[PDB]
Amino acid sequence: IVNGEEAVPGSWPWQVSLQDKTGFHFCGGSLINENWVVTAAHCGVTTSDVVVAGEFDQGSSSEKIQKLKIAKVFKNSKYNSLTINNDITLLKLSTAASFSQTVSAVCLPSASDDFAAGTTCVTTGWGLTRYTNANTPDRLQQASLPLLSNTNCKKYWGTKIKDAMICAGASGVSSCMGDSGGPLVCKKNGAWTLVGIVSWGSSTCSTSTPGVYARVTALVNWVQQTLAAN
C-alpha cells in the first residue's frame, strides 16, 4: 500500500499473508471462516504455499502466528488472466485456524448489497509501499479510501472495467504489488464487510489512479456454492 499507515496490531484479524514454503510473502487473503480463505486468482496459490494468520510484523521473531497448510485451491473458472476479471480464488485449509482476539473472520456481503460510490472504505496488506522499493514492508499497513462508480472508474481505465470489478482510491493512496488478494472492507451495520479483493492497477501504483478490486457481490454466489459443495 502506497502512502498508507501502520495498522494497530491485531486490529484486522481476518488479514492473512500467503507465503511460499520459505516465508516469502507474495499475496494477502481474508479468513471468511475457520477453514476457508478468500484471495485473488492471479496470486497463483498452490498447495505448497502456506497461510499465515495472526501476524502483524513479518520481521518479528516472536508473535503468535498460525501457519496453516492449504488442502485445496479453488480458482474461479471464469477467471481470465488477460482481462483479469473474476479474480478470485478460495483456499480450503487442511487445518482449521483457531479464532482468538487477533484471528477471526470478515463478513461477506449478500449478492444484493449495495455500497455507494463515495463511501470511505479500508484496504490493508503488506504490499509495496513504493513501486520502486525492493522489499515488502515488515508491518501491516492500512489506508482508507473512497469507492468509485464503474462509470467514473471507466474515465481512467476505459472498457477494462468489467461488472465483476469495483474501483477505489485515486486519492493519495494506492494498493500495490503484494497487496493482491487482500481485503477492501467497508462498514455495514457495525461490521466490516468484504466488498473488494485487491486485484490490479497501474504498475507504478500511482496514487492519482484508482486501484481495481474484484467485486465481492458479483462473486458471492460462486463463493457460497463452492463452500456448500466442499
Binding site: 494497530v8 484486522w12 482476539q101 470478515v106 461477506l108 472492507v185
Partner: peptide, 13 residues
Amino acid sequence: CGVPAIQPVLSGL
C-alpha cells in the same frame, strides 16, 4: 464476523 476484538484506529474516517 467483521468486528475486531482490537479496534482499528484510522486517520480517514
